[PDB]
């Protein structure tokens, strides 16, 4: 969509891989400002919000946490305390007609700065004075939208660039979109250090014959000592025993 109509989308009830983003070297910029980008897929957030648009070459640096500017003042207000990430890549191959791609419009003049994370499409020809600008433009009446002139002859400062911004939240309600994790191969008959679904321990784990109700995971004892465990990937029953200790 255009700059003035930057679409705002939310994502919920999934697992966000982020793997394609970190190895993304064909796209020019993947810059996360709020948190370290590489160590993000290993953490969780309640929601993630994506705002997508195609902007100027100069405006690429303008949409940043705390960074202001023309589009950053009139078309996209990013708050100072914004923790998020920005993805940007040149799209002059598609977003440039031979005669000029004029599907993209931007407003640059509004009498009052827009609130953060708000989309406003008031297309009234700006009324500067007390005269009514009801389709009458010029002095004290400004035509509200300028079309993006996207041509190959335009400089790097005025080139089309596809840019999306991601905002991460973890809120009082329990989160949904946590990051994917990796499961190592199973090991039997050795005092290893095991971690099943947050439960942690050290011991030797062997095959079992205990029968579990189809909804149960753990298995414990009289004195609050975990004894059996159900394997989370494929379903089995494994007893655990602390590896041998004694007196010499």
């Amino acid at each position, epitope marked *: *969509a*255009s700059v003035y109509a930057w*679409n*705002r989308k939310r994502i919920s009830n999934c697992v966000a891989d982020y793997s394609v983003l970190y190895n993304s070297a064909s796209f020019s910029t993947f810059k996360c400002y709020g948190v370290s980008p590489t160590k993000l897929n290993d953490l969780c957030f309640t929601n993630v919000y994506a705002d997508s648009f195609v902007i100027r070459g100069d405006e690429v640096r303008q949409i940043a946490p705390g960074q202001t500017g023309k589009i950053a003042d009139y078309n996209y207000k990013l708050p100072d305390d914004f923790t998020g990430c920005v993805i940007a890549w040149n799209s002059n191959n598609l977003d440039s007609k031979v005669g000029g791609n004029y*599907n993209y*419009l931007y407003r640059l003049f509004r009498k009052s700065n827009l609130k953060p994370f708000e*989309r406003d*499409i008031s*297309t009234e020809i700006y009324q500067a004075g007390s005269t009514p600008c009801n*389709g009458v433009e010029g002095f004290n009446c400004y035509f509200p939208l300028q079309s993006y002139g996207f041509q190959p002859t335009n400089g790097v400062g005025y080139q089309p660039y596809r840019v999306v911004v991601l905002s991460f939240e973890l809120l009082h309600a329990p989160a949904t979109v946590c990051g994917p994790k990796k499961s190592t191969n199973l090991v039997k008959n050795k005092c290893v250090n095991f971690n099943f679904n947050g439960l942690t321990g050290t011991g030797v784990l062997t095959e079992s014959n205990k029968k579990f109700l189809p909804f149960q995971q753990f298995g414990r004892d009289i004195a609050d000592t975990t004894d059996a465990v159900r394997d989370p990937q494929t379903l089995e029953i494994l007893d655990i025993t602390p590896c041998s200790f004694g007196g010499v």
Partner: antibody
Amino acid sequence: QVQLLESGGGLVQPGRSLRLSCAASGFTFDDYAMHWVRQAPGKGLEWVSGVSWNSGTIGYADSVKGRFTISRDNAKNSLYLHMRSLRAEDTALYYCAKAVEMVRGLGADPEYGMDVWGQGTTVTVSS
Amino acid sequence: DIVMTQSPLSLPVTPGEPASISCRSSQSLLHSNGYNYLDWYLQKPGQSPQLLIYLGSNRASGVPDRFSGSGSGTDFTLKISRVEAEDVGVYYCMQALQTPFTFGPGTKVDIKR
């Protein structure tokens, strides 16, 4: 039930603006591309404008390039169509239409196939 | 800028012969991926507009299977072999490739006498 509420009726003189609003009921706004098709009497249907499921404007018509504008409202499930500096030669009946194709139907984005039409209004571009 | 045409404008049909109207385009409508991007539209006089056919060969829901928009490149023909009494209507063919999107002339098939 899928109900199309079209608002913005009234009389407009050439040289001024216009604004129509589309409201949809019975289905999710974001899943389908929304198009505008007009049809003057004694002539068939003709595409006038459109916008994809991603609220991406598709362009402007050959006859009226530079003055029409189209926008979506995914927050309130609404749609705006604004007519900048109309002329008496633009007089016709406007029509709002919805797509069909379910999201991620595989190899381009599903944005075509208008199916459902209500009715427009009494747009008369005369002074 | 992209002209699509229908022919003939109106032909009178009776049960016993197919209803066949040809659409002529300016673009190659058989896309180079095994898929076509030409759609077909119906208008019943006195009722809200309808579709005919998805992408030339995909069959729409709510419509009879006798609708067939077939051909190649720019040459297509809408053929209905079996027509029931209420199939009096206006017809369009519409391209799904680029802008401006073109609707063909709306051909009126009415009652022959």
